[PDB]
RNA sequence: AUCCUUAUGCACGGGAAAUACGCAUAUCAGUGAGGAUUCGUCCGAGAUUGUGUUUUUGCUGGUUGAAAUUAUAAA
RNA sequence: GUUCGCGAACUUCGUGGACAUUUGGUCAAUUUGAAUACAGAGAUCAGCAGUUCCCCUGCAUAAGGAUGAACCGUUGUUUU
């Protein structure tokens, strides 16, 4: 009842022999070839275009919803670790680097470069659990690594160092503005640090 | 950010089948449908009824035949 | 009586069989107030998509994992 498109023959490979609505079909036969597998071609791309338009689109809603999306959060699971060293540079980084991705509400302080720490991470719970796995599973905090400085590449073995999970628990409010790792020089300052969130506890002295 | 799992949705592509595939102001149904069994037990999701098509829906193309047939106008 | 056969002088005598019958056989159609018709009016070949179920492939969403990436992050005249 409308005639606004038209519905042609879906050639192939395997029909083009066979089809002869479309004309050229024996008497031009490379032309009829080139048209078949043309159109065989036309309709992969088509797809292949769909697809892309559509990753394309996701994109473009992911990066904007994100933005949109500053839900009230009516509960922060949070996970508090201490080690005994991080010297190393690779440690660090992926505490950063993940923490940043997981909009993880938190800090890892700890004493003297060499010296214990704490870390505190808080927020959803799958992420906390993701951060505890990185932690423990993924990171070997007894492996052996290389320090780049100008005098010389230092090598820091530590079999010594460990880590370990305090808390597991679940805040009242998350006062931690976002994901403050530090070092400091002694322990008092650390606590100062640890309560200007109103919250020195997560430290455990052992 | 990279890789994978599941479900789905959209599609490319490749197949098989339509004896199949629906629908219901229906009756019942994980508060057990229907089935297994070595008999100790085990699986666990439709069944009943009614009914619409079902050697098929929608569209295209050819050959044909069918009989397939040619405008006006001035000297 | 009507046929077929055989004995005696086509023709005739002597003789042995067999001898029903009709129902089941109306073209329809049109023009009638019997004529026209004349058996009664798309075929065949071939694509494609649909529907269902499967498998693969790429994308999307949900979820859910696993893993990577250096390095530290935030509450009296020249360097003021």
Same mark, same amino acid.
């Not at 038209?6 to 029909?15: D, F, G, T």
């Not at 088509?46 to 919803?65: G, S, Y």
């Not at 959060?73 to 940043?100: A, D, E």
């Not at 409010?173 to 002694?186: A, E, I, L, Q, Y």
């Given at each position: 009842?409308?005639?606004?498109?038209?519905?042609?023959?879906?050639?192939?490979?395997?029909?083009?022999?066979?089809?002869?609505?479309?004309?050229?079909?024996?008497?031009?036969?490379?032309?009829?070839?080139?048209?078949?597998?043309?159109?065989?071609?036309?309709?992969?791309?088509?797809?292949?275009?769909?697809?892309?338009?559509? +990753?394309?689109?996701?994109?473009?809603?992911?990066? &904007?919803?994100?933005?949109?999306?500053?839900?009230?959060?009516?509960?922060?699971?949070?996970?508090?670790?201490?080690?005994?060293?991080?010297?190393?540079?690779?440690?660090?980084?992926?505490?950063?680097?993940?923490?940043?991705?997981?909009?993880?509400?938190?800090?890892?302080?700890?004493?003297?470069?060499?010296?214990?720490?704490?870390?505190?991470?808080?927020?959803? &719970?799958?992420?906390?659990?993701?951060? &505890?796995?990185?932690?423990?599973?993924?990171?070997?905090?007894?492996?052996?690594? &290389?320090? +780049?400085?100008?005098?010389?590449?230092?090598?820091?073995?530590? +079999?010594?160092?460990?880590?370990?999970?305090?808390?597991?628990?679940?805040?009242?409010?998350?006062?931690?503005?976002?994901?403050?790792?530090?070092?400091?020089?002694?322990?008092?300052?650390?606590?100062?640090?640890?309560?200007?969130?109103?919250?020195?506890?997560?430290?455990?002295?052992?």
């Amino acid at each position: 009842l409308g005639l606004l498109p038209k519905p042609e023959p879906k050639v192939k490979l395997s029909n083009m022999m066979s089809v002869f609505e479309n004309d050229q079909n024996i008497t031009d036969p490379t032309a009829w070839e080139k048209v078949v597998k043309d159109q065989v071609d036309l309709r992969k791309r088509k797809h292949l275009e769909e697809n892309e338009r559509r +990753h394309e689109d996701a994109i473009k809603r992911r990066k &904007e919803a994100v933005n949109m999306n500053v839900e009230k959060p009516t509960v922060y699971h949070c996970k508090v670790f201490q080690f005994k060293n991080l010297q190393n540079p690779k440690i660090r980084f992926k505490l950063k680097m993940n923490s940043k991705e997981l909009s993880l509400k938190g800090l890892c302080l700890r004493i003297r470069d060499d010296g214990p720490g704490i870390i505190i991470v808080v927020g959803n &719970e799958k992420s906390c659990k993701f951060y &505890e796995n990185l932690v423990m599973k993924r990171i070997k905090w007894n492996e052996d690594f &290389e320090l +780049h400085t100008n005098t010389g590449d230092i090598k820091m073995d530590m +079999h010594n160092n460990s880590i370990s999970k305090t808390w597991e628990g679940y805040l009242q409010d998350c006062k931690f503005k976002g994901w403050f790792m530090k070092v400091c020089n002694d322990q008092d300052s650390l606590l100062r640090t640890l309560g200007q969130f109103d919250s020195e506890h997560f430290y455990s002295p052992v």
